[PDB]
């Protein structure tokens, strides 16, 4: 699996900013937003990896993702 | 290479096509739509 | 290699699981019989006005195969 950081397409980043009420989006925002999302994903998934490793499990469950988000003050409801 | 003014009508929606057979003259887009309507 | 080599030797059979699904349908068989129809009609129009009444013929030399297919169908029931 390579070049998967481009999976978050420019209209997808455009649509995300539209939900946030952004009037205009620069061309350099998409590269920065991908990097910010990559950094944020690299922290939540790594925390979920330790949660999955602690349970002697090989598949990451949704409950471990919730605990990974809860410990950083970003608790998620619905899972 | 267009029988009408060079640019199916390009740059328009699909609900404008017409393929009837009449006389065809290019005239360089009617002298570029009459010099863009005589410079506006 | 014991499981790699024989799978590598299969070229048409690897895609057969999807080729059979895509090809053993109604529209493909109708197309493949209409193609033979237009081939015969065009060839006879070129050659001779009467048209043969036989196309895409199957031979039935074995009788036990029908019972084997019935056994498979019965297992499917």
């Amino acid at each position: 699996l390579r070049d998967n950081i481009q999976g978050i397409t420019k209209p997808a980043i455009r649509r995300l900013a539209r939900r946030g009420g952004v009037k205009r989006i620069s061309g350099l925002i998409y590269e920065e937003t991908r990097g910010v999302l990559k950094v944020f994903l690299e922290n939540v998934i790594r925390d979920a990896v330790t949660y999955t490793e602690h349970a002697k499990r090989k598949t990451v469950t949704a409950m471990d993702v919730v605990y990974a988000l809860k410990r950083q003050g970003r608790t998620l409801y619905g899972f | 290479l267009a029988f009408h003014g060079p640019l199916h009508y390009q740059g328009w929606k699909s609900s404008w096509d017409e393929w009837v057979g009449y006389d065809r003259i290019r005239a360089y887009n009617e002298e570029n739509i009459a010099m863009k309507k005589r410079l506006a | 290699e014991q499981k790699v080599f024989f799978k590598s030797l299969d070229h048409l059979g690897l895609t057969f699981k999807q080729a059979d699904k895509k090809l053993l349908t109604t529209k493909q068989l109708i197309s493949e019989i209409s193609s033979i129809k237009v081939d015969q009609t065009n060839k006879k129009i070129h050659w001779l006005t009467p048209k043969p009444k036989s196309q895409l013929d199957f031979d039935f030399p074995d009788k036990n195969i029908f019972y084997d297919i019935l056994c498979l169908a019965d297992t499917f029931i």
């Binding site: 998967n4 999976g7 978050i8 900013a17 939900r19 009420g21 620069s26 910010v36 790594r46 970003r74 | - | -």
Partner: protein, 98 residues
Amino acid sequence: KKPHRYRPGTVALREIRRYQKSTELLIRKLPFQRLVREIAQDFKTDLRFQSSAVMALQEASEAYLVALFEDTNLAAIHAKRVTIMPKDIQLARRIRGE
């Protein structure tokens, strides 16, 4: 014959209104799914994720980025602008402490 030729900004505000009252997921499923597996394979190989596990990751990442974009947009009007910049995001993360 004259094209409609909407000026920039109006359809963007229309997209803002149509996507603020809606709740469908903006990011596609498999592109976000494949990004998770590539990131996770750097930490541990032969790792699997449940379908609902990625569902929790996708909604949380979108809401975090939308909230970041809200602060990013709020920085633009604060800086007498309507176009967001990469430096606007950097200021937003620094103030939040990320």
